[PDB]
Amino acid sequence: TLEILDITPCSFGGVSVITPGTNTSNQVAVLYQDVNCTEV
């Protein structure tokens, strides 16, 4: 079909782990860099 399709690359980004020292606790909060929350 004579139609034009734009191509956007699939989302990616770094993963960072915000963490208080292991010596204190072990809960972590994961930051996914530059991705809208729906895409996770």
Partner: peptide, 22 residues
Amino acid sequence: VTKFNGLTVLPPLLTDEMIAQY
């Protein structure tokens, strides 16, 4: 004062508004 190959541009920690407040 004036792509998607793995290159990323992280944002600064102090936003321009906060710098203006300083």
